[PDB]
Design an enzyme around this catalytic site. Structure first.
Site, mmCIF file in Angstrom:
data_model
loop_
_atom_site.group_PDB
_atom_site.id
_atom_site.type_symbol
_atom_site.label_atom_id
_atom_site.label_comp_id
_atom_site.label_asym_id
_atom_site.label_seq_id
_atom_site.Cartn_x
_atom_site.Cartn_y
_atom_site.Cartn_z
ATOM 1 N N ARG B 249 57.658 2.730 11.364
ATOM 2 C CA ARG B 249 56.247 3.125 11.318
ATOM 3 C C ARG B 249 55.753 3.742 12.633
ATOM 4 O O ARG B 249 55.103 4.792 12.616
ATOM 5 C CB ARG B 249 55.417 1.910 10.958
ATOM 6 N N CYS B 320 46.153 7.288 -14.721
ATOM 7 C CA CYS B 320 45.323 6.592 -15.682
ATOM 8 C C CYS B 320 45.085 5.108 -15.451
ATOM 9 O O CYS B 320 44.890 4.358 -16.410
ATOM 10 C CB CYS B 320 46.000 6.717 -17.041
HETATM 11 C C1 LLP Z 1 65.178 -4.664 9.427
HETATM 12 C C2 LLP Z 1 63.912 -3.903 9.435
HETATM 13 N N1 LLP Z 1 63.642 -3.006 10.399
HETATM 14 C C3 LLP Z 1 62.474 -2.305 10.381
HETATM 15 C C4 LLP Z 1 61.519 -2.485 9.385
HETATM 16 C C5 LLP Z 1 60.227 -1.753 9.363
HETATM 17 O O1 LLP Z 1 59.939 -1.200 10.622
HETATM 18 P P1 LLP Z 1 58.448 -0.737 10.935
HETATM 19 O O2 LLP Z 1 58.248 0.601 10.288
HETATM 20 O O3 LLP Z 1 57.635 -1.953 10.589
HETATM 21 O O4 LLP Z 1 58.637 -0.420 12.391
HETATM 22 C C6 LLP Z 1 61.763 -3.413 8.281
HETATM 23 C C7 LLP Z 1 60.912 -3.836 7.121
HETATM 24 N N2 LLP Z 1 59.852 -3.024 6.639
HETATM 25 C C8 LLP Z 1 58.820 -3.687 5.854
HETATM 26 C C9 LLP Z 1 58.141 -2.831 4.799
HETATM 27 C C10 LLP Z 1 57.498 -1.611 5.377
HETATM 28 C C11 LLP Z 1 56.012 -1.669 5.222
HETATM 29 C C12 LLP Z 1 55.454 -1.361 3.852
HETATM 30 N N3 LLP Z 1 56.314 -0.544 2.979
HETATM 31 C C13 LLP Z 1 54.225 -0.562 4.155
HETATM 32 O O5 LLP Z 1 54.025 0.558 3.683
HETATM 33 O O6 LLP Z 1 53.396 -1.021 4.941
HETATM 34 C C14 LLP Z 1 62.984 -4.148 8.317
HETATM 35 O O7 LLP Z 1 63.182 -5.058 7.302
HETATM 36 C C1 LLP Z 2 43.396 6.707 -22.085
HETATM 37 C C2 LLP Z 2 44.433 5.631 -22.278
HETATM 38 N N1 LLP Z 2 44.902 5.390 -23.507
HETATM 39 C C3 LLP Z 2 45.858 4.464 -23.793
HETATM 40 C C4 LLP Z 2 46.423 3.637 -22.833
HETATM 41 C C5 LLP Z 2 47.466 2.634 -23.244
HETATM 42 O O1 LLP Z 2 47.111 1.340 -22.955
HETATM 43 P P1 LLP Z 2 47.999 0.068 -23.356
HETATM 44 O O2 LLP Z 2 47.795 -0.193 -24.861
HETATM 45 O O3 LLP Z 2 49.403 0.445 -22.907
HETATM 46 O O4 LLP Z 2 47.335 -1.175 -22.719
HETATM 47 C C6 LLP Z 2 45.988 3.808 -21.432
HETATM 48 C C7 LLP Z 2 46.575 2.930 -20.372
HETATM 49 N N2 LLP Z 2 46.005 2.988 -19.041
HETATM 50 C C8 LLP Z 2 46.263 1.822 -18.171
HETATM 51 C C9 LLP Z 2 47.724 1.380 -17.961
HETATM 52 C C10 LLP Z 2 47.769 0.058 -17.228
HETATM 53 C C11 LLP Z 2 49.167 -0.530 -17.181
HETATM 54 C C12 LLP Z 2 49.649 -1.018 -15.820
HETATM 55 N N3 LLP Z 2 50.484 0.043 -15.120
HETATM 56 C C13 LLP Z 2 50.518 -2.226 -16.073
HETATM 57 O O5 LLP Z 2 51.712 -2.218 -15.823
HETATM 58 O O6 LLP Z 2 50.079 -3.258 -16.552
HETATM 59 C C14 LLP Z 2 44.979 4.838 -21.159
HETATM 60 O O7 LLP Z 2 44.516 5.023 -19.902
#
Ligand code: LLP
Ligand code: LLP
Ligand code: K
Ligand code: K
Ligand code: K
Ligand code: K
Lengths: 418, 393
Positions: B249, B320
């Protein structure tokens, strides 16, 4: 569903042992039941019966070509949110006349493509969007069929979460302004009002809000009749929930009958956009235990948040079960309380917490209810290849999405010239 | 930061509007100079290696910049191993972290002859030793120590360091830790407990050739602490060993932005929305962590005479879900069609991106002085369903 343990002890998917499929493909692997998908779509379609309806499967839940194709064969419609989804549906042999297009951020390019494919309806979400559509329809000299996505005034004292979600969020036009915008649409030359649309939320476990929403939209339709605007269909979105842990949502049949009963003596065409209710429990994700770390305990598996993000993103509870209930290999499996976690380098990378499991390193685990919002939300974080996806039919398993190869990871990437 | 207002927003020598005009939005844009400056700030005697944390941003051009400056790399998968090699990185300067390393990954890393495996479990020691044995090489190793699924608790350090010593196809090279991310100095230093542990290992005959202190050094997103120089000093002063650092980071976050176009404005007495063409599949940090990322206009002084009333907007994408947002309650002067720039997206931006809603991944662009290179092409639609097949009934 057709994921069932047998007198044997072994977990089966329709006619096949799960261990058998993952032996060919390896883990991690998504596995889908053809029968479960079909049954779940039909449960919806039948229950609507004689009332004029279309079932527009929500592609976003699972957009795999084979999956879409199953729907397309049964004569399903499709609800899409992008040109990518439009092309997926056409590719899979879906009928573009049975396609409705939802989405708050539709581009001119997408609207053009959808117009040129001659889709059923655009579910519009803003005023700005009306002008854009009309503007593109004009340039192509066609008439764009449209509904407005309406946010009914659901009673907050009876459905507080749904109600405030409707109010606080980027979707739809508030009912208080329905007529005003429906008017603007009527005044637009290259639009053609066909319907009314709504979508009230997702993973809803009660019938009441759906009915409540219907009522207020019927009232609105009538007010529109009087104002000399005609309405050919009413789209009630998706949102019907499923059992992940301990929930008891209405099953599709019950949900539909209530809606149909409320249709009393009308001939208005009803469109439904279910996603989750069709696919959630039509798929699982299989993964292999790599290591056990004992202290809190961890089962470290080969699936992660890039394969399935729902637990990390929503704290979703997804049931995690063993591949066999009666292991007869004589390995030592002390029951313990594990967090199930993947190889990704974040504490957020987990699949489930505090599960009572009898595990040895090398065992396969099955994460249930991953057929919806599973692979569709998957990524390549930590430069992991996306999982294989497999569709089971009776005693036949077909690879419907090949595992990505490493050399696909950097496709289209370029170093600086020296 | 070479992202600087200068009349119009510029990235090094180029107006941002100029690059996105060729490529379209959404687009990630990276500063070469910022990347290099930030890696050097860390690097600038005491025997050390800087192992850039690939996970933060794994793009080939980016990795290559590090490789040219002689950087090492911290990787967490065979995918990252191959990226680094592909970018011309030196596999001898690679350390491999991760709780879930497969035999395949360990084999590939051994065969590429990497510097060190940062081990996170006992089970993993056996696995490595077992694969090393089968290849007849000696696997270099540290233990990741916790002074989380991660690491070995310091209370058991000696016991596992012992087991490692007893293993023939392993070779103890080091001690490793990583304490968290976006930290933001005191917790770092509180090193002390690892030095104590090193010494206890000397007495037990053991020898430790290097100490790996992980990454975790935070950056300014909103109003946030230590710059790399100061963080390092404190660590050096408190020293003797060879020190390995794994920053991600602190090198990349503010070396990149994400540019997006306003499609629609939805106005309500109650809440306003700017609907943009970037979404949580392009940048997931706000949705996943409630991260605050600053969102700024492409021009401070618009001279197209459009009416731009300042309002409070939520910035949201086309996906969505309610969760699809980039930022909340921002005071902005916007017209439809305007371009916005989301800052501090060079780390954990594109690396966490997906194709949700069947959206194509964004183009990524690397700016050098007055030259812009496309370092990752926008995906085409037909890439979305790569490897997919319908059933033949
Ligand atoms: C061994 C090791 N080195 C370095 C880093 C990260 O380095 P930094 O960029 O902190 O200097 C991580 C974990 N990294 C942890 C996850 C990264 C954060 C999350 N996706 C976010 O977007 O905030 C690690 O596990
Ligand atoms: C306009 C519209 N129609 C239909 C659906 C279908 O809905 P369902 O019956 O699948 O509930 C969605 C879902 N829009 C929202 C999706 C939220 C799911 C989230 N990533 C999750 O993993 O739970 C929508 O935005
Ligand atoms: K009209
Ligand atoms: K996919
Ligand atoms: K040894
Ligand atoms: K095919």
């Amino acid at each position: 569903d057709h994921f069932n343990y047998q007198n044997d002890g072994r977990l089966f998917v329709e006619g096949l042992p799960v261990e058998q499929v993952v032996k060919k493909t390896g883990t991690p692997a998504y596995i889908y039941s053809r029968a479960t998908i079909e049954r779940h779509w039909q449960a919806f379609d039948s229950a609507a019966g004689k009332h004029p309806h279309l079932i527009c499967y929500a592609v976003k839940a699972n957009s795999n070509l084979a999956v879409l194709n199953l729907m397309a064969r049964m004569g399903s419609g499709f609800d899409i949110v992008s040109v990518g989804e439009l092309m997926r549906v056409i590719q899979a042999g879906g009928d573009p006349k049975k396609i409705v297009f939802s989405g708050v951020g539709k581009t001119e390019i997408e609207i053009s493509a959808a117009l040129q494919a001659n889709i059923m309806c655009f579910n519009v979400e803003s005023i700005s969007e009306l002008y854009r559509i009309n503007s593109v329809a004009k340039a192509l000299n066609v008439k764009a069929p449209i509904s407005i996505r309406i946010n009914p005034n659901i009673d907050a004292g009876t459905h507080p979460y749904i109600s405030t979600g409707l109010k606080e969020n980027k979707f739809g036009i508030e009912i208080e302004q329905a007529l005003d915008v429906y008017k603007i649409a009527s005044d637009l030359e290259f639009l053609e009002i066909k319907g009314v649309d709504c979508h009230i939320g997702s993973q809803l476990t009660e019938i009441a809000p759906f009915i409540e929403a219907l009522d207020k939209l019927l009232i609105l339709i009538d007010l529109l009749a009087e104002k000399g605007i005609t309405i050919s269909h009413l789209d009630l979105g998706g949102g019907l929930g499923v059992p992940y842990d301990d929930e008891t949502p209405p099953e599709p049949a019950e949900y539909m009958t209530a809606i149909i009963n409320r249709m009393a003596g009308r001939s208005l065409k009803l469109i439904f956009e279910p996603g989750r209710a069709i696919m959630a429990n039509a798929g699982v994700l299989v993964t292999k235990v790599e290591f056990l770390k004992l202290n809190k305990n961890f089962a470290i598996v080969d699936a992660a948040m890039n394969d399935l993000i729902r637990p990390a993103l929503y704290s979703a509870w997804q049931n995690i079960i063993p591949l066999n209930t009666d292991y007869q290999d004589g390995q030592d499996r002390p029951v313990r309380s594990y967090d199930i976690v993947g190889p990704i380098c974040e504490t957020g990378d987990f699949l489930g917490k505090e599960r009572q499991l009898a595990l040895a390193e090398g065992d396969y685990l099955v994460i249930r209810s991953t057929g919806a919002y599973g692979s569709t939300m998957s990524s390549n974080y930590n430069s992991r290849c996306r999982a294989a996806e497999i569709l089971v039919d009776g005693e036949k398993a077909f690879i419907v999405r090949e595992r990505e190869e490493l050399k696909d990871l950097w496709r289209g990437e370029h170093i600086l010239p020296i």
